[PDB]
Design a protein around this ligand. Structure first.
Ligand SMILES: Nc1ncnc2c1ncn2[C@@H]1O[C@H](COP(=O)(O)O)[C@@H](NC(=O)[C@@H](N)CCC(=O)O)[C@H]1O
Length: 803
């Protein structure tokens, strides 16, 4: 079970140190003492009223004060009144009055204490934000705010505006508690399993001495490919290019059908002249041993098979390239040969930054950005540069006996979550289209199927209705409109989902936890029909929590997706590749094949991890010609076992399972690739305060405890000069509703009520919000796994690949 670890770049002490510990402890005492006094007051009013009617004024007024929570008037609580009561009631009343008086004075003290503590935390914020790793991450993410931080550090007691402080505090929180790839903010490395036995400890994990992260700077894939195509279109770079036939090209005995340039990937049908048709035929023998076509020898080769005239062998070739039938690619791995502008880019990208302070980093990046735009425009490209932080040595060892039950529970969970996959309706609808248009035993060239489906989506007919609903632009009509659908299997799916949900939720809440036994989900699964197929491998992102819990954040496709990028980034930093193991082709008659090349994204560059590959129009791969399945070679058939559409190689017979193993999001995939993944891939991806409990499937936390608060329930700073009195009212409301001190509020906001910065960020974000969802912080930052020496505890997250 292959494992990686993502670690926050700031230690937990970084956000702990921003808490106003003294005044919050007093805010908490006050809130609990106010609630206890008000409760006790009302109970003492009951007992006093009993006493009143046991006799048969003053008492009626004292009663009224206790009931309503105010100090009794001097005339309502006197030695005589205390005399007319039973000693135990008199003493209870006495204690209440004392405590009420103490509470009132402590209410008066609080605002100066809190204000003074909050203000001291301003300098603690700069202390925490001084970290070099953090300033570097911030410098990429937010350069002006980062320069302002650098000035603050150089000029202390140059107290920046509140709004800058809130922005800094938010990034600090991100870097201390959020395990998302955002830039130097977190870093990633591999974990290993270490010899049970050595864990008398009790630890589930043990960390090596902290390796300083190494950083890899990369250009926007979209920038890169726009600039590359620009260069490949210029006449002089034909001799610096190789050519190949577009692997979507299909000659339909008359016309050429193919897919054109990304990102709008038009489906193209064009008329062949007999000369163009012969040009396309002679591309075959003109090809390399690996399919590439030397353009010079091809222009001659054409000169002496057509008539001679080179002047128009060139324009004909040019017209084929501009059209997309023949693809121009550069001569070398990643970038262009060594042309002037490209070797500067490539070197500046590669520049080892060592010893560089954040201001020099900012300067350097701004300069690189310019050279990029004085070459191909940014356009609407958001971010021209990304950075990623990795470590080269294993970061941690894992305790295989303490992990054990958790991984077992996780596998059961991983399988059961298949029923919820947002691609299942797609599969069902696509399969039904196949059956309806072409017949149960039909075998449809993939490209013709893609075109037909796309025609249905663009047009108007009821034959296209389901495709438009589930495969078209839309999440659905309202929610995924199953249950009341024409297709039986969409309705069977809806009931299978409802039964899955009701099995999970049909159980008691004890201490805010509903606990599902994994064997219950195994029992439910043995019942499912064959058209729910469980992926063979999943990347499970989990965070450990107390009592051996794994909190599941995210599942995606496995097969090394994620890990393969990590191996390739480590390989770049070390200067030697990591042999990530290959995907096994199984059962016989089935192969797994990733899409060739990187499909326009730097997040798809990785250890090539499938034997064969789907050879994809403008995204050449790195495989022997015999190991390429061109789009032209794929067909779509209905499988008898599942009744779902599958892919076959016409040339070789195998069932072909398309894989996306790069880290590009599915919407960044060009259209036919997106369709392949969505349709053929085997991965998945009121009126008062309402509490939803946490849901665990033995030790795997599948849903964290939550609290839903409508707009109207949540305290609002009355801008009648409200100040710290606000925190008091907010903490009174949260405590009364069981909302913990630390939570993630809905990208979720980390809220520490003790942190004066995060409370204000919270105040500001939630205005004009219809609902506010609080989620327990689990693991809590305080629960971060311990360390040795001077390495401070950090929040972490594991990528665990389960197979
Ligand atoms: N209830 C809660 N308890 C405790 N930790 C919570 C948490 N909710 C989020 N986290 C953390 O913060 C992160 C979301 O913040 P954001 O990056 O989306 O803005 C989470 N990270 C992830 O889920 C990762 N899979 C990466 C997600 C991605 O790539 O977008 C958590 O680390």
């Amino acid at each position: 079970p292959k494992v990686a670890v993502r670690e926050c770049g700031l230690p937990v002490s970084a956000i702990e140190s921003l808490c106003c510990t003294d005044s919050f402890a007093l805010i908490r005492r006050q809130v609990r003492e106010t609630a206890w006094l008000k409760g006790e007051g009302k109970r003492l009013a009951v007992d006093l009223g009993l006493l009143i009617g046991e006799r048969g004024p003053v008492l009626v007024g004292l009663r009224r004060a206790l009931h309503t929570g105010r100090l009794p008037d001097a005339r309502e609580w006197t030695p005589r009144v205390a005399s007319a009561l039973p000693a135990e009631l008199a003493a209870r009343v006495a204690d209440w009055v004392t405590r009420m008086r103490a509470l009132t004075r402590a209410r008066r003290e609080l605002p100066e204490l809190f204000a003074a503590e909050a203000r001291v935390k301003e300098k603690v914020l700069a202390q925490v934000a001084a970290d070099p790793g953090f300033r570097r991450a911030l410098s990429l993410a937010s350069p002006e705010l980062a320069a302002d931080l650098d000035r603050w550090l150089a000029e202390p007691a140059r107290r920046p505006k509140t709004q800058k402080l809130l922005r800094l505090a938010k990034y600090v929180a991100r870097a201390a508690v959020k395990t998302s790839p955002y830039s130097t903010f977190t870093s990633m490395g591999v974990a290993v399993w270490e010899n049970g036995e050595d864990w008398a400890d009790g630890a589930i994990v043990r960390f090596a001495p902290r390796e300083p992260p190494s950083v890899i700077l990369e250009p926007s894939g979209e920038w890169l490919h726009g600039a590359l195509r620009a260069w490949l279109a210029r006449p002089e770079n034909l001799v610096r290019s190789r050519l190949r036939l577009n692997p979507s090209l299909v000659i339909r005995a008359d016309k050429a059908e193919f897919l054109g340039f990304p990102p709008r990937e038009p489906i193209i049908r064009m008329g062949l002249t007999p000369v163009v048709a012969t040009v396309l035929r002679l591309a075959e023998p003109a090809a390399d041993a690996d399919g590439w076509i030397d353009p010079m020898g091809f222009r001659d080769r054409l000169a002496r098979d057509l008539p001679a005239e080179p002047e128009q062998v060139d324009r004909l070739l040019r017209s084929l390239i501009e059209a997309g039938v023949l693809e121009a690619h550069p001569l070398t791995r990643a970038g262009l040969p060594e042309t002037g502008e490209w070797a500067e880019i490539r070197a500046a990208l590669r520049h080892d930054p060592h010893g560089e302070d954040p201001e020099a980093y900012r300067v350097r990046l701004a300069r690189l950005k310019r050279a990029m735009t004085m070459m191909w425009p940014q356009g609407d490209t958001t971010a021209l540069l990304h950075e990623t932080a990795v470590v080269t040595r294993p970061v941690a060892s894992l305790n295989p006996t303490a992990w054990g039950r958790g991984l077992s529970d996780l596998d059961v969970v991983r399988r059961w979550l298949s029923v919820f996959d947002g691609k299942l309706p797609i599969r069902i609808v696509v399969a039904e289209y196949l059956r309806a248009r072409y017949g149960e035993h039909a075998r449809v060239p993939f490209l013709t199927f893609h075109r037909h489906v796309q025609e249905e989506i663009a047009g108007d007919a009821p034959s296209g209705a389901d495709l438009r609903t589930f495969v078209g632009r839309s999440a659905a009509i309202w929610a995924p409109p199953l249950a009341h659908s024409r297709l039986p299997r969409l309705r069977e799916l809806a009931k299978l989902r409802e039964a899955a949900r009701e099995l999970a939720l049909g159980r008691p809440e004890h201490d805010g936890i509903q606990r599902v036994d994994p064997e219950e989900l195994i029992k439910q699964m043995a019942t499912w029909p064959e058209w729910i197929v469980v992926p063979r491998s999943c990347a499970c992102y989990v965070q450990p929590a107390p009592e051996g819990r794994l909190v599941l954040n995210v599942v995606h496709g496995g097969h090394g997706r994620g890990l393969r990028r990590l191996s390739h980034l480590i390989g770049r930093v070390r200067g030697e590749a990591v042999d990530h193991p290959m995907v096994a082709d199984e059962p016989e008659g089935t192969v797994y094949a990733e899409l060739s090349g990187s499909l326009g994204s730097t997040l798809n560059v990785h250890v090539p991890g499938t034997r064969y590959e789907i050879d994809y129009p403008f995204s050449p791969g790195d495989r022997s010609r015999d190991r390429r399945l061109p789009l032209s070679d794929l067909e779509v058939v209905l499988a008898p076992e599942t009744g779902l559409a599958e892919l076959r190689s016409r040339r070789l017979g195998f069932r072909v399972i398309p894989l996306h193993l790069g880290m590009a999001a599915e919407f960044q995939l060009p259209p036919a690739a997106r369709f392949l993944e969505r349709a053929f891939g085997v991965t998945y991806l009121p009126q008062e305060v309402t509490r939803y409990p946490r849901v665990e499937v033995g030790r795997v936390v599948v849903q964290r405890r939550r609290w839903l608060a409508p707009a109207g329930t949540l305290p609002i700073r009355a801008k009648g000069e409200d100040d710290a009195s606000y925190l008091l009212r907010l903490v009174a409301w949260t405590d009364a509703n069981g909302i913990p001190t630390r939570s993630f509020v809905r990208k979720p906001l980390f809220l520490d009520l003790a942190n004066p910065f995060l409370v204000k960020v919270f105040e500001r974000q939630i205005r004009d919000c219809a609902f506010v969802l609080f989620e327990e912080a689990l693991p809590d930052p305080a629960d971060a796994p311990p360390r040795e020496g001077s390495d401070l505890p950090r929040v972490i997250e594991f990528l665990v690949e389960l197979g």
